[PDB]
């Protein structure tokens, strides 16, 4: 979408993969942010972010 519109996709994409937050081993912060991500994942607020940023 960032003009010039001189680039295009071809092919039906290659694979399926996830993006997520990460945290080093033993860090106490991990699960208390993971539950917040789970909240957002089930509340769907991410759709607002996707709209805003694409």
């Amino acid at each position: 979408q960032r003009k010039p519109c001189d680039t295009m996709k071809v092919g039906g994409n290659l694979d399926s993969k996830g993006y997520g937050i990460a945290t080093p081993k033993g860090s106490s912060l991990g699960t208390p942010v993971n539950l917040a991500v789970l909240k957002l994942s089930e509340q769907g607020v991410l759709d607002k972010l996707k709209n805003k940023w694409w």
Binding site: Y19, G20, L40, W53
Partner: protein, 108 residues
């Protein structure tokens, strides 16, 4: 009593964007974007205090050869420059064995 943490993120233009007043702002104000307002929402639920920082290597970066010792962005966690990563980064076991990951937020 009080506690704070340092966060790693990256200036991929869909995910983080440099606000025009880029001369002197702090990372908690320098930036906007999907990672930035996701992080803000997460901090809104979890309440912890933090500061955003760019990955100091500024890149994904490779394994160290034969050692597989980390690139900048993972080493900054394991070696304590930061304590959490909120970035467009692919989940894989070759990373999961070393550090924990959230539930994925997107599938792509």
């Amino acid at each position: 009593e009080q506690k704070t943490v340092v966060v790693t993120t990256i200036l991929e233009s869909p995910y983080v964007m440099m606000k025009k007043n880029h001369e002197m702002l702090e990372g908690n104000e320098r930036y906007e974007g999907y990672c930035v307002d996701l992080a803000a929402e997460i901090a809104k639920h979890c309440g912890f205090k933090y500061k955003l920082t760019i990955v100091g290597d500024g890149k994904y970066g490779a394994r160290d050869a034969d050692t597989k010792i980390w690139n900048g962005m993972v080493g900054e966690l394991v070696y304590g420059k930061a304590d959490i990563a909120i970035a467009p980064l692919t989940i894989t076991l070759v990373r999961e064995e070393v550090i924990d990951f959230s539930k994925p937020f997107m599938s792509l």
